Scaffold this active site. Sequence first.
Site, PDB file in Angstrom:
ATOM      1  N   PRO B   1     -40.605  -9.389  28.987  1.00 19.12           N
ATOM      2  CA  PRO B   1     -41.709  -8.383  28.966  1.00 19.12           C
ATOM      3  C   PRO B   1     -41.893  -7.750  30.344  1.00 19.12           C
ATOM      4  O   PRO B   1     -41.641  -8.409  31.377  1.00 19.12           O
ATOM      5  CB  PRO B   1     -42.960  -9.104  28.565  1.00 19.12           C
ATOM      6  CG  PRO B   1     -42.426 -10.113  27.580  1.00 19.12           C
ATOM      7  CD  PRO B   1     -41.051 -10.460  28.143  1.00 19.12           C
ATOM      8  N   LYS B  32     -43.232 -15.524  25.181  1.00 19.52           N
ATOM      9  CA  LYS B  32     -42.023 -15.482  26.015  1.00 19.52           C
ATOM     10  C   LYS B  32     -42.156 -16.461  27.165  1.00 19.52           C
ATOM     11  O   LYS B  32     -43.273 -16.737  27.641  1.00 19.52           O
ATOM     12  CB  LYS B  32     -41.816 -14.046  26.518  1.00 19.52           C
ATOM     13  CG  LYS B  32     -41.550 -13.042  25.407  1.00 19.52           C
ATOM     14  CD  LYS B  32     -40.140 -12.786  25.164  1.00 19.52           C
ATOM     15  CE  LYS B  32     -39.995 -11.673  24.137  1.00 19.52           C
ATOM     16  NZ  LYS B  32     -38.598 -11.500  23.729  1.00 19.52           N
ATOM     17  N   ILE B  64     -38.675  -6.999  24.417  1.00 18.29           N
ATOM     18  CA  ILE B  64     -37.651  -7.155  23.360  1.00 18.29           C
ATOM     19  C   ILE B  64     -38.296  -7.956  22.257  1.00 18.29           C
ATOM     20  O   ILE B  64     -38.411  -9.178  22.349  1.00 18.29           O
ATOM     21  CB  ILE B  64     -36.399  -7.814  23.935  1.00 18.29           C
ATOM     22  CG1 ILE B  64     -35.777  -6.974  25.043  1.00 18.29           C
ATOM     23  CG2 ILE B  64     -35.419  -8.076  22.796  1.00 18.29           C
ATOM     24  CD1 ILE B  64     -34.701  -7.729  25.810  1.00 18.29           C
ATOM     25  N   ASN B  97     -49.259   1.938  26.550  1.00 18.33           N
ATOM     26  CA  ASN B  97     -48.120   2.267  25.668  1.00 18.33           C
ATOM     27  C   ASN B  97     -47.277   1.019  25.395  1.00 18.33           C
ATOM     28  O   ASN B  97     -46.762   0.439  26.348  1.00 18.33           O
ATOM     29  CB  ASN B  97     -47.258   3.349  26.316  1.00 18.33           C
ATOM     30  CG  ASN B  97     -47.890   4.721  26.413  1.00 18.33           C
ATOM     31  OD1 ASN B  97     -47.591   5.464  27.382  1.00 18.33           O
ATOM     32  ND2 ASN B  97     -48.689   5.097  25.485  1.00 18.33           N
TER      33      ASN B  97
END
Lengths: 114, 114, 114
Positions: B1, B32, B64, B97
């Site tokens: 991230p 993660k 991801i 975003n």
Amino acid sequence: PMFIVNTNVPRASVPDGFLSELTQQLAQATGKPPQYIAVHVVPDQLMAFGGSSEPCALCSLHSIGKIGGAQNRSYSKLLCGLLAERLRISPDRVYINYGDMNAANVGWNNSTFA
Amino acid sequence: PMFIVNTNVPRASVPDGFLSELTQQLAQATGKPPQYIAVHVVPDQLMAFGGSSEPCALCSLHSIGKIGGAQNRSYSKLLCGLLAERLRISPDRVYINYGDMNAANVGWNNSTFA
Amino acid sequence: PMFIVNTNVPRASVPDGFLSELTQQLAQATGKPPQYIAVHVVPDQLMAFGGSSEPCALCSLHSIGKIGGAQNRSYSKLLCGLLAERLRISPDRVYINYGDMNAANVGWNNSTFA
């Protein structure tokens, strides 16, 4: 193509000629003319990677095409190589986001590339 | 991230420990490992939100996977909560975003995650 | 909508009122209320465009809808016009990445726009 590097490495550690080297190497790697390559380096940033403030870089490469599995592996070896050699950043402390732009979604010169 | 915060709040208003707090809380929220979490805070920016220069933030979270409707609501409550508590930014003056990156489009350690 | 401009033009060359002008003109162009428009100008950047460091800009416009071939051409004319008039940047030294965001992928006010 547009390549952006954000890093905690200080401005004084960015060698003279680094923007020109990035421009030339990205023109060669993407096959695009250097006149269309834009490069942006942002040093002295407040950032961490894995919780650590050791040297790191957060990057993006946007291009209209020339983005894909094998190409991106090649770009990553090239650009991690440059950041390791020129800015002394370890490759495992670099992220590069690759973005394949549609021509209609890139503005330039009062219009788009569509 | 990869989490980036751009804000008009001044550097002195960013508390000590903030990048670590972001790293820890993003590891928990995304699931993660913390070693893969990158954070970047950019204070002192020339920005406006709704035409106003009151404190605000423009942010991105790329990952991801681990991006989706419910997850992103949870991330927004976490991250707006941190920006309110630590930087005194109103949640309604924050945009984030969210980007779900294909593994083939993230460079790291001389290659990609594909 | 979120509009970001990164430029090598110096901070003193950014005229008073520029963030407000961008806010107003993007409200009109996107049809979204100015209360929802965010703008961010980053001067004094280390960048090159096409191998040279005359004034240039690397920009993004993210919006939930209101992104498309004809709209993006109109945005590019408007924004290249503003950057030429106000920052004296040649339109052929401007790139604008247009991003159409899904509402579920934009955080705001402790949730998303979904």
